[PDB]
Amino acid sequence: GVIDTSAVESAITDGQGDMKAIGGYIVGALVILAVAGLIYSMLRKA
Amino acid sequence: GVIDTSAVESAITDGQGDMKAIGGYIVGALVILAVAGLIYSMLRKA
Amino acid sequence: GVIDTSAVESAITDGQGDMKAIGGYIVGALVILAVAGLIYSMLRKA
Amino acid sequence: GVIDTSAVESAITDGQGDMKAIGGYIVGALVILAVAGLIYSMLRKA
Amino acid sequence: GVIDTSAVESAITDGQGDMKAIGGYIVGALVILAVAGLIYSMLRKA
Amino acid sequence: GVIDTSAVESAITDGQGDMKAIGGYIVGALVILAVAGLIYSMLRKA
Amino acid sequence: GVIDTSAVESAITDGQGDMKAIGGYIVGALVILAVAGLIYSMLRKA
Amino acid sequence: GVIDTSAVESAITDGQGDMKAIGGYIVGALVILAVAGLIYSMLRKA
Amino acid sequence: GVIDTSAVESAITDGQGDMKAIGGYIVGALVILAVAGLIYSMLRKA
Amino acid sequence: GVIDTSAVESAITDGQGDMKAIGGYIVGALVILAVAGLIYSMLRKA
Amino acid sequence: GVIDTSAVESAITDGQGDMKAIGGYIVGALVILAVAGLIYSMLRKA
Amino acid sequence: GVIDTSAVESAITDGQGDMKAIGGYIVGALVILAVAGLIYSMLRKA
Amino acid sequence: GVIDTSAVESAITDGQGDMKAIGGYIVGALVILAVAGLIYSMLRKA
Amino acid sequence: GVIDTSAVESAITDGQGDMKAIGGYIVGALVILAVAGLIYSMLRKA
Amino acid sequence: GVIDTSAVESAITDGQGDMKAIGGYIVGALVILAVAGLIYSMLRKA
Amino acid sequence: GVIDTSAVESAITDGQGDMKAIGGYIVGALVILAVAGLIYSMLRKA
Amino acid sequence: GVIDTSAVESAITDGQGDMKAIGGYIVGALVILAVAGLIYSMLRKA
Amino acid sequence: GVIDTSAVESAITDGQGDMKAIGGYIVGALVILAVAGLIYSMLRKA
Amino acid sequence: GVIDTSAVESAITDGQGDMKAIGGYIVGALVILAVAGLIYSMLRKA
Amino acid sequence: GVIDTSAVESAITDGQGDMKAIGGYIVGALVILAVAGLIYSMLRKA
Amino acid sequence: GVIDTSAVESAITDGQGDMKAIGGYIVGALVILAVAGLIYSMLRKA
Amino acid sequence: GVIDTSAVESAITDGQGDMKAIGGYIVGALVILAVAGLIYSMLRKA
Amino acid sequence: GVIDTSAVESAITDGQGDMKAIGGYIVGALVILAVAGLIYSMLRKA
Amino acid sequence: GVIDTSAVESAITDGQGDMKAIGGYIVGALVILAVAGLIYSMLRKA
Amino acid sequence: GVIDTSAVESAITDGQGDMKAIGGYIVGALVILAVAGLIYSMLRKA
Amino acid sequence: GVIDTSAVESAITDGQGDMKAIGGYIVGALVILAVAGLIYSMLRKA
Amino acid sequence: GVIDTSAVESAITDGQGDMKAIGGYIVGALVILAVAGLIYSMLRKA
Amino acid sequence: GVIDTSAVESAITDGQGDMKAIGGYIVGALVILAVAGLIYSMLRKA
Amino acid sequence: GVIDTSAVESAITDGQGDMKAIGGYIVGALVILAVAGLIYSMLRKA
Amino acid sequence: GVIDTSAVESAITDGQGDMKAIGGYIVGALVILAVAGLIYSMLRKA
Amino acid sequence: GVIDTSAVESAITDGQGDMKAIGGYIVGALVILAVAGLIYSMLRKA
Amino acid sequence: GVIDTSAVESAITDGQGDMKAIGGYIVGALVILAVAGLIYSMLRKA
Amino acid sequence: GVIDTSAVESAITDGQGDMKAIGGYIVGALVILAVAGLIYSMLRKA
Amino acid sequence: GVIDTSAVESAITDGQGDMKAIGGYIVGALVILAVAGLIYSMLRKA
Amino acid sequence: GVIDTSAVESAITDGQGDMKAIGGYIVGALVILAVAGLIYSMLRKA
DSSP states (O other): OHHHHHHHHHHHHHHHHHHHHHHHHHHHHHHHHHHHHHHHHHHHHO | OHHHHHHHHHHHHHHHHHHHHHHHHHHHHHHHHHHHHHHHHHHHHO | OHHHHHHHHHHHHHHHHHHHHHHHHHHHHHHHHHHHHHHHHHHHHO | OHHHHHHHHHHHHHHHHHHHHHHHHHHHHHHHHHHHHHHHHHHHHO | OHHHHHHHHHHHHHHHHHHHHHHHHHHHHHHHHHHHHHHHHHHHHO | OHHHHHHHHHHHHHHHHHHHHHHHHHHHHHHHHHHHHHHHHHHHHO | OHHHHHHHHHHHHHHHHHHHHHHHHHHHHHHHHHHHHHHHHHHHHO | OHHHHHHHHHHHHHHHHHHHHHHHHHHHHHHHHHHHHHHHHHHHHO | OHHHHHHHHHHHHHHHHHHHHHHHHHHHHHHHHHHHHHHHHHHHHO | OHHHHHHHHHHHHHHHHHHHHHHHHHHHHHHHHHHHHHHHHHHHHO | OHHHHHHHHHHHHHHHHHHHHHHHHHHHHHHHHHHHHHHHHHHHHO | OHHHHHHHHHHHHHHHHHHHHHHHHHHHHHHHHHHHHHHHHHHHHO | OHHHHHHHHHHHHHHHHHHHHHHHHHHHHHHHHHHHHHHHHHHHHO | OHHHHHHHHHHHHHHHHHHHHHHHHHHHHHHHHHHHHHHHHHHHHO | OHHHHHHHHHHHHHHHHHHHHHHHHHHHHHHHHHHHHHHHHHHHHO | OHHHHHHHHHHHHHHHHHHHHHHHHHHHHHHHHHHHHHHHHHHHHO | OHHHHHHHHHHHHHHHHHHHHHHHHHHHHHHHHHHHHHHHHHHHHO | OHHHHHHHHHHHHHHHHHHHHHHHHHHHHHHHHHHHHHHHHHHHHO | OHHHHHHHHHHHHHHHHHHHHHHHHHHHHHHHHHHHHHHHHHHHHO | OHHHHHHHHHHHHHHHHHHHHHHHHHHHHHHHHHHHHHHHHHHHHO | OHHHHHHHHHHHHHHHHHHHHHHHHHHHHHHHHHHHHHHHHHHHHO | OHHHHHHHHHHHHHHHHHHHHHHHHHHHHHHHHHHHHHHHHHHHHO | OHHHHHHHHHHHHHHHHHHHHHHHHHHHHHHHHHHHHHHHHHHHHO | OHHHHHHHHHHHHHHHHHHHHHHHHHHHHHHHHHHHHHHHHHHHHO | OHHHHHHHHHHHHHHHHHHHHHHHHHHHHHHHHHHHHHHHHHHHHO | OHHHHHHHHHHHHHHHHHHHHHHHHHHHHHHHHHHHHHHHHHHHHO | OHHHHHHHHHHHHHHHHHHHHHHHHHHHHHHHHHHHHHHHHHHHHO | OHHHHHHHHHHHHHHHHHHHHHHHHHHHHHHHHHHHHHHHHHHHHO | OHHHHHHHHHHHHHHHHHHHHHHHHHHHHHHHHHHHHHHHHHHHHO | OHHHHHHHHHHHHHHHHHHHHHHHHHHHHHHHHHHHHHHHHHHHHO | OHHHHHHHHHHHHHHHHHHHHHHHHHHHHHHHHHHHHHHHHHHHHO | OHHHHHHHHHHHHHHHHHHHHHHHHHHHHHHHHHHHHHHHHHHHHO | OHHHHHHHHHHHHHHHHHHHHHHHHHHHHHHHHHHHHHHHHHHHHO | OHHHHHHHHHHHHHHHHHHHHHHHHHHHHHHHHHHHHHHHHHHHHO | OHHHHHHHHHHHHHHHHHHHHHHHHHHHHHHHHHHHHHHHHHHHHO
């Protein structure tokens, strides 16, 4: 019932919180990766 | 008879009380379950 | 005899009254049950 | 009987209410997930 | 006897009335469920 | 005796009449039930 | 009995009617889904 | 006695008739169901 | 029973008909896709 | 008794007949499905 | 007495005759039932 | 009495005979079912 | 039943509506992605 | 079923339409790219 | 029972027979696929 | 009673015998299945 | 009854405790997995 | 008579006492069961 | 009566003991299963 | 009377003896069943 | 079963037929591509 | 449902925002790269 | 009961034994697979 | 299937048509380029 | 779908716009380069 | 059970055998490919 | 329950241990790969 | 596709136009250069 | 399985055959190219 | 849950640490490469 | 496959044909160039 | 999400910083190279 | 599990062995290539 | 694996063989070229 | 992880070692080349 389902929203909320966060930190890695590639290209070139 | 049947309503009432409650706490488990799945998916992905 | 049998109808009437009532309150429980199952399914799923 | 079955509609109604709601909040998670994937792809790429 | 059995048809009729109705409202829940699944799939995918 | 027993056949006849009839209307309920289950399955599935 | 069972065929018929219909509309969703995937692939690619 | 029991066979016969028939029409529903699932799978896939 | 199962073959047949057809039209899309890739490669190259 | 149980074997036999048959036609669908997937893969690839 | 009791055996014999027969025809129904269930399962499955 | 009860053993024996037999033929159906499922899985897969 | 199944069509309709829409907005992202790749290629080149 | 599957062809058709179109406009970009390379080569050279 | 279960082994045996066979023919397709890819690579390259 | 219950153990024993056996032959199928999947993967890959 | 149902809450509580915990340790594995993938990508690249 | 019927209430009271108690301890088992299922699901999943 | 019902609690207690234990050992299997899956994923990946 | 009722306890005792025993051997079957399922799952999986 | 599985081989055969064919026509494109590159090189050079 | 899907558009919007932005900053790098190449060529030359 | 449940532990133990073993041999395959991929990459590259 | 695969050949054909054509027009550019180089050399020289 | 694909054309258009522009400004550099070479040659010479 | 699981090892063994073999022959192709590239480079060069 | 779930942590721990280890040895391969590429580049160049 | 490839010819045409033109103006420079050399020689000489 | 995998070797063999052949004919082109360059150099020179 | 997700950040952190480091050491190689090229050019020249 | 690869030889053949031809006509230009230089030298000289 | 994408800009910024810098120091080398060539020419000449 | 994972290290080890070896022999080719270029330059020059 | 990798060495060996050979014959051309230049110089001179 | 990444540094180190070395020996060749050119010039001259 209802009340029990307010608790649903609560745990789901924590859930989404976690997600965008984690997904964010992954991106931190990717940027470092990306950019390290661009330098690698600058040497290749000149 | 009648009076005896008011007591019926009484015990049945307790009955339903118990039910929606228990059924509720089960759902608490399910949400935790569900959401723990979503995080598991965020790692899989990124 | 007859008169005595009008009293029959009377006690039987109370009888049926009681029945549909009690049977009704049982159903209240079942609906709560049913629907609590449907929520349990929504978590399972998503 | 009838009256008892109006109460059925009532509890079932709450039921469906709960469902589309919960199912909705799950989707909130999925969108965040999805889109976090698209960014992950933008880095991969460039 | 006969007359008493016309009343049978009557209560049984109410009975069936109730049934297809309730069974109907359950389906309302299921559709909402179903379709909420399809959206969940659209995110998964794209 | 005999004549008295023709009346037996008569009341028994009414009896059987009633039975197959009532038993019939019960089945009307069951079919509605059954089939409402099949729809419930179509949603579950797709 | 027999007659009562013609009514069976009747309610079952409605039943099947409903089914292929609903199952059909679900497919409408799936096609839209499918094809939206193919476009998503055309971008990925070129 | 005997004769009375030939009538038994008769009503039982009708009985079985009804059964395989009804059971048959149910299957009509199931096939429609089944196959509608297979199409649903063809979209999922391609 | 048997007869009822000839109808099974019938609905299943329609089923398979549908499948190879749909699966076919999907392929029409894929070829267009594929080949559009090959042109994209001819430009890349020269 | 015995004789009555030879008829059991008979109806059960028809039963199994039906089964392996139907189950067979389902497989016809699956093969068409499968293989249509393999072509879909040949385009994806080249 | 004795002779009168040979007639007992006679009517009892008819009795048992009737029984195993009727009980037999009931089983005919059950087999049809059973097996119709197995087909219902083959669709469910595949 | 005793002798009458040897006949009991006799009819019960036939009884058990019938049972393991019938139960056996049912299993024949199940195996066909089972295995038809495994093939269905081989297509699904490859 | 029927009426209850008109409501099915209704919720399914909303369903499909949602889908093609969402699937659409995803594509908006992909195009931006794609094209940003093409510019990245123009620099690489010249 | 059949009719429902004509709608499949319809949505798939739109699908393919979209594809060859989009894939086409991508090529417009590539040609401009290509040719801009050839001019870049004419300067390099002379 | 036992004998009935020797027949189990028999139908299961056919079952496995079918499986490794079908699974085999699928592989025939895959090899053709694979190798057609390798040629596609030889052109790409030289 | 006791003796009658030694026969219970006996039939139950046969029972379990049958079970682990049949369950075993099913596994034979599964292994063939599994491994045929792994080869399918080796082609996919290289 | 009530008291007996307080014990329900108790065992269910332990239940949920266990769940989020276990689900947590699984995630520990996934992160290690994920990140080990990212390093694998850094080598691939440079 | 009356007094004798006060003793009725007494033994019936003990009766009900016993019942709700026993019924309670059964539930203790069920909860342990239930929850052990939920853990089993957490492993299945992750 | 009462005393007899203390013995009820006793046998029920053993009962629950058994349950949580067995249910526990099942979980031992599941964990081994789960984790063996995670390794299988590490190979798939790298 | 009393003495006669000591013999009651005696036959009832044998009774319970038999029960827990038989019920035990049934469980032997179930475990074999259960566990054979878990292996079936290990193949499915890997 | 067997016969049903000869049809498997049949549809799979068509399948492979299609594959090597299509894969072939793709190669026709690649050769034209390749060689058009070699001419492009002859101009570059001289 | 609908409302829940307005939130979809919202998160997707942010998504696309992010993308064209990031993709933009990457291009900033590429231009700097490109042009640094052109200077490198001016020295090579004169 | 208890003793019967020691046998449970026994069969479950064998069960788990089997599992980690089988799951192990599967991994043997995967490693061979994996590593054969790495060599395939060394050729691709140089 | 087959017919669907004749359409494959058709779209692939158009594909190759396009390719050799485009690749051709590129060469037109290259020749003009080449030869313009040769004149540039005649001036350099004399 | 369609509308969503008009937006595709739109973003692709911007895309191509950007390209021919950028590619153009690069050429501005090349001409300056080229011609600065020709002067360098006039000094070398005379 | 155990014995049945020795057969598991057996079929898995064949499995791995097949794999390293096939994977091996693929490499034969790759080497031929690789080296044919190196010759192609020797011409390019001198 | 709890204790049973400490064993969960234990097997999961071993699990993660295995993972980071294996994932590690894979990386050993990749580094050797990577670096062997860099040497290949030094020859290409000078 | 075709139409899209007529546009290819169009942009390529502009391309070649540009080329022979630019290449032409370069030659204008070269002639002026050349001839200025010849005068330089006439002075050297006489 | 094994036999099925002999066919693997067979198709792979054809595969490699094709490769070294095609790769060979490409080289024929390259030599003609190369050497045509050397003549071009003899004119340049003398 | 939350706490479990702090550990996520932790392992991801190590992850990124590793990455920028490794990516760094690769660059050390590239610089040595680059510069060794410049010396190679100084000899070529003078 | 094979046949498809005879067509490879065919298109490659045309390819080489084209090459030696074009390369030839280039040489025609070079000779005219060369020799025009020799006359230029005869004037310089005498 | 957003915040996470501000960090993107940050790491990309560092990235570009690095690039123009490194690219700059390369040019320092080139100038030294260039000019050392011009002196080499002054000796050649006079 | 553990032991099974020692075998992982073993097959991975062989793996890396193979790699550095093969990668090595490739380099043998490259050196021969390189140096053959240097001789080609000595002729060009003197 | 190992054995498969001895074949690698074999094909690579042939590879290198081919290379130094071809590279050798190219040099034969260059010497003839070179020396023909020296004679051309002897005439120029005297 | 970390430790595994210390080994990365190790193999990369060897890598760079190799590079500057090889690149060095190439330069030895170039100097010999260069200087042999200068002598060639001294003869040309005087």
